[PDB]
Amino acid sequence: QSFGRVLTIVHSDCALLERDGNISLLSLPVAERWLRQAQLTPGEAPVCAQPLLIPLRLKVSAEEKSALEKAQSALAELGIDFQSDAQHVTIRAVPLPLRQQNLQILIPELIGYLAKQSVFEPGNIAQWIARNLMSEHAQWSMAQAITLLADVERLCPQLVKTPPGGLLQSVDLHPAIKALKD
């Protein structure tokens, strides 16, 4: 299905939508998040490690290093590969959705998150990366909102069928209609 037709951008990051006479307000940041999670999750989209131009070498504490080692397998399932020596880790590849992020901030952030876990699972790591570590977004445009919803419709069919309250809300016309008649 579909969220409908994008009508206009509301308050820099929402999209006013129309579907069968119904008007809705959708949060683009929330939609972007669901999209990224699906694109990063093995089993919901193609996952292929992408080589870094220049590998990112980082110093890590022993507890971080140890966390990285236990997570190696989960990370590789996400397309995140690295090698490491005594005091460092060097990121050699990341999945496509991450290739254009600022990895000098994202990876150290991922490392901090990983150093706090007891269990490592690609699914939960993808979700975390999708919600917290990714590129913030400035003013949204129509072209961007249109593209986003289309991608979300394609990869997250379920969101369409049952959109949470933080994703899309009903814009009630009854008051205006009544006010026009009355």
Where along the sequence are the contacts to its own copies (CB under 8 A)? 58-61, 63-64, 102, 104-106, 108-109, 111-112, 115-116, 132-136, 138
Nearest to 110 by CA among 133, 77, 88: 133
**CA-angle at 38, arms to 158 and 93, nearest 5°:** 170
Consecutive H or E run containing 82? strand 81-84
For residues 61 and 170, which CB has a smaller minimum distance to its own copies in the complex?
61
> Residue 62: is it exposed, middle or buried by C-beta count within 10 angstroms (0-12/13-18/19+)?
exposed
143 binds Cl ion (CB under 5 A): yes
In the stretch 100-139, what mask flags binding to Cl ion with x, by CB under 5 A?
----------------------------------------
177 binds Na ion (CB under 5 A): no
105 binds Na ion (CB under 5 A): yes
In terms of DSSP H, where are the helices of the chain?
A: 28-40, 62-77, 103-114, 122-128, 142-155, 157-161, 174-181
For residues 112 and 164, which CB has a smaller minimum distance to its own copies in the complex?
112
166 binds Na ion (CB under 5 A): no
Return residues touching Na ion (CB under 5 A): 105, 112
